[PDB]
Amino acid sequence: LDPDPEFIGFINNVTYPAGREAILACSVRNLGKNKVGWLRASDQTVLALQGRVVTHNARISVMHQDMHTWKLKISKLRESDRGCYMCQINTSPMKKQVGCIDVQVPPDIINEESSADLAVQEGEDATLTCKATGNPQPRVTWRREDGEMILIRKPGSRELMKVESYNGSSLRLLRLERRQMGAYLCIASNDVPPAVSKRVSLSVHHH
Ligand SMILES: *[C@@H]1O[C@H](CO[C@@H]2O[C@@H](C)[C@@H](O)[C@@H](O)[C@@H]2O)[C@@H](O[C@@H]2O[C@H](CO)[C@@H](O)[C@H](O)[C@H]2NC(C)=O)[C@H](O)[C@H]1NC(C)=O
């Protein structure tokens, strides 16, 4: 009774920022004549079998540095690499363990959902919006490029109040004065560097 292959540990779920090299580790004992492969769990396509990488994906590699551990390696990690990967032993039936990769992604500003340069007549309201994406979800701050204070609603009231900056995707300017013209900068960050900014130029005329 020299027994069947068995998984020794488990593949821990991992988190990497984009651009790094993701490594998943799979440990098996008593492999014998059987084979260890990796598959992408989404589409069941074979990434590797034994020491051969079967996919044509140039970013995928496998390692086997000691006798009980098999590693899958994904270089230049992308959002599309997110998800679960399966270590499989070709027993009958197959034995499988699953490990999943959470890819942290630095923020993007979705330009086509965000404000372009605009002009308004003095007195109009204008909302400046930066819709940002990323993982974790970014936060957005607004400030004037020239460092001058921004006029926003005084909370609960109908009056306005000066602030150094505003935290939120939509900067809501009310009854604009001509001196509120100029460049507004929205900065999106989620602590996965770099942050990202969009410059929005506001013109205020007579109207
Ligand atoms: C390991 O991760 C899978 C995948 O879930 C994703 O990755 C996690 C690390 C985390 O970021 C989740 O928010 C992601 O959805 C886990 O399976 C998921 O479990 C949740 C809650 O039980 C469920 O809503 C999802 O549908 C599951 N997704 C899949 C693809 O199965 C799994 O539970 C994690 N394992 C351990 C031991 O923590």
Author numbering: 35 to 241
Wording from the paper:
Our previous work identified the first IG domains, termed IG1, as the domains mediating the Dpr–DIP interaction by the formation of a pseudo-symmetric IG1-IG1 heterocomplex using the GFCC’C’ face of the immunoglobulin fold.
During our crystallization trials, we also grew crystals and determined the structure of DIP-γ IG1 +2 in a monomeric state. In all structures, the two IG domains are in an extended conformation. The extended conformation is due to lack of linker sequences between the two IG domains in DIPs, which also holds true at the predicted DIP IG2-IG3 and the Dpr IG1-IG2 boundaries. However, despite the lack of sizeable linker sequences, the DIP IG1-IG2 domain boundary is flexible, allowing for movement of the DIP IG2 with respect to IG1. This is a result of the lack of stabilizing influences such as calcium ions found in cadherin domain boundaries or hydrogen bonds between the domains observed in SYG-1 and SYG-2. Lack of rigidity in Dprs and DIPs might indicate that they may not serve as signaling receptors directly and may not relay force or connect to cytoskeleton.
